[PDB]
Amino acid sequence: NDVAELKQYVLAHVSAQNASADGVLARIDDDGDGPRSWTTQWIRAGEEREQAGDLLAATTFYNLARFPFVDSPGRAEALRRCVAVFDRWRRTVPGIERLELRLPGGVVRAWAAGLSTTERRPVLLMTGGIVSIKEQWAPILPELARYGFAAVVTELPGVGENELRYDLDSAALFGVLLDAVAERADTSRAYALALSFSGHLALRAAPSEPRLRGIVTAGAPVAAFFTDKEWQAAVPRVTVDTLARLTQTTPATVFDHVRNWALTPQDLAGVRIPVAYVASGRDEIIPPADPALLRTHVRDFRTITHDDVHGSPAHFPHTRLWTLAQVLEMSGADPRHRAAVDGALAQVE
Amino acid sequence: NDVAELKQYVLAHVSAQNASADGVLARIDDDGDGPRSWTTQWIRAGEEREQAGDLLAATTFYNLARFPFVDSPGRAEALRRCVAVFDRWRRTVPGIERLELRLPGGVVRAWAAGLSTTERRPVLLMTGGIVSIKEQWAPILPELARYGFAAVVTELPGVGENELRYDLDSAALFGVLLDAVAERADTSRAYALALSFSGHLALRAAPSEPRLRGIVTAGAPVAAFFTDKEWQAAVPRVTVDTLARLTQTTPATVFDHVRNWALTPQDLAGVRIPVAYVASGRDEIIPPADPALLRTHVRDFRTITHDDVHGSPAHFPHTRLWTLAQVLEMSGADPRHRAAVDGALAQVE
């Protein structure tokens, strides 16, 4: 992995939320093994905070150690202790449960909250993209539960502890998670807060999974991402390598491998549910043609655009409230919750 | 206090950094001392996170309980617990120490890092505004120390554990802080990173404190803030009440009391150092004419405007880098540090 690419992810998506990260960046010279390497430095910084009692700080740093995907025994150890340190933290928070699903293609693990035997709460499935482990979003589970959801936070196939191969049959993962919490939630009403590539997977699942009632995404790939080769040549190496790893192909073959993932107009027409999309004006990963294709073909499309890079990290104050407003509208959540968020949303604009 | 005002500060300056905050806001109906009151809910939320081992989260919540100023035994108790839980956190972080100055007019406390009897590192004095206690910024001391500074974080007179009366002689505070760390730092070269009202104090002190070599501020009141009665009538009640409390006057008299705080053209002509200024276009506290007067009267003025409310909380990613860049250029810090910040600062733009 190119270390400049790796550092630039921290600068844009982390430094502003934890400024100790800039101190660790300044001790990292390469991506190998060894005392000044990315993985070692991030692991040592996580041990320091873990031993100091800061279990979320330690979670962040061990997450960073494993980023962008586990390609080494140093990284595999990173993830193992990111998962474990977050497991320690979550126990001091009531209502956060581990879900384990054993499937033919391997094990999927997840974090949930707002689950109940006696009540039937609408399901919120939350997933990042291809470099985003589930422990990034899990801390937010209690807030999700407060808004009325049986909230499940997971990982795309090949990410974190998710063992499946990432392929077109992974669209079926929404439905299988639903099946696992059917005794503890209203799986008749599910909503996918599915960021980046997981948004693509959600779109693909919609036409043959009627329990999915709405999708809220940010910078999901659609069609041009998979078909436009010139654009692909300029896509960051980390995107290409990670997607190779997840699909179980190779950096040089992955775009040809995934060419038939393109959502056709027949596929978008089967999407008969509300779709919200947060778009980034400077997106390095998604071509402009993809958000446009959803605007043309999806019957109930809501969208907003920020002048930012992928995942709009400089616009989190706006995107957290906008994505949440969309989720509550789609699910017909309590007006009191909707007024609160919409008041907070009007405040930021 | 007006509980709606209180909740909006949390909405604009905190929620995006800690989403648990929105959960506690939903349980607060008033600013009394009942079980659904502001102070009780924030204290209960800090206890829960303190018992769980999240000492920074607890610090934040006890800070909120105390906010905007201690006017009751509940808030006083909040503050005492905020200071104590911050003290436990910082014992886990090597280099962070407590400074206590016993003055004629009362006791001032501070957090410092990067102090050394065998080196002479330039001083970075850091201070918030009138509702901003020490412990909000203290977590970033080690980052300040990493950039080469002998860093001291403190509070305005009457805020947090600072016992002084906030008056015109309070400009002498910077110089007295320097004196206390004269054996452990290069107090010939001091830089004030002084937000909001502390910015004004710093400007005031500059022409009679030659050890102050530069000021980096955000939304500092200058002149019009103090003299324009029409503007003052629409200033938020919490600003009015806090300022009355600090100055040891009353809400109905505070603007008449501080009318002579306005920095005259003679005052500004005595400011012979660089001053950087982050301005907010929707600033609800500082009239436009204040930034403009500094542009015309300060010989080395640097500035930048965001489309945001006071303290530009939606633009933290940008302001952390811009203010830091300014501090490092001002202080002739190592070019390796300036290159890294200026790279980060070009990425975020």
XYZ file of C-alpha atoms in Angstrom, chain A residues 11 15-16 19-20 22-23 26 48-49 52-54 89 92-93 140 143 146-147 314 316-317 320 344 347-349, chain B residues 8 11-12 15-16 19-20 22-23 26 48-49 52-54 89 92-93 140 143 146-147 282 314 316-317 320 344:
56
model
C -6.003 13.794 7.428
C -7.517 14.102 12.248
C -10.382 16.595 12.882
C -5.929 15.311 16.879
C -3.531 12.714 18.511
C -1.554 13.755 13.556
C 1.119 12.784 16.134
C 4.382 11.992 11.916
C -1.228 3.149 24.995
C -4.912 4.332 25.025
C -4.900 4.211 29.760
C -8.631 3.252 29.831
C -9.775 5.108 26.611
C -16.484 -0.896 25.733
C -20.504 -0.714 29.764
C -23.323 0.367 27.381
C -23.823 5.170 17.610
C -28.789 6.748 19.467
C -33.480 5.916 20.930
C -35.145 6.878 17.608
C -15.872 18.072 6.084
C -20.535 15.532 8.704
C -22.590 18.081 10.764
C -25.628 13.246 9.931
C -31.500 20.735 14.275
C -30.180 25.234 12.352
C -27.132 23.951 10.339
C -28.436 25.356 6.929
C -28.965 25.314 20.763
C -26.879 21.477 18.932
C -24.335 23.746 17.187
C -23.814 17.204 18.995
C -21.771 16.581 15.845
C -24.229 12.101 19.434
C -25.048 10.840 22.964
C -28.835 14.598 21.557
C -30.082 11.867 23.908
C -34.335 14.974 24.790
C -22.723 7.115 33.880
C -19.759 7.671 31.500
C -17.921 3.276 32.676
C -14.326 4.595 32.310
C -14.954 7.228 29.553
C -7.511 11.557 32.611
C -2.748 8.774 32.230
C -1.181 11.134 29.643
C -4.951 18.836 22.954
C -0.328 18.014 20.282
C 4.565 18.107 19.816
C 4.713 21.298 17.706
C -23.512 34.858 10.728
C -19.489 23.746 11.352
C -13.716 23.084 12.694
C -11.763 20.951 10.118
C -7.964 23.934 13.321
C -3.172 19.244 5.444
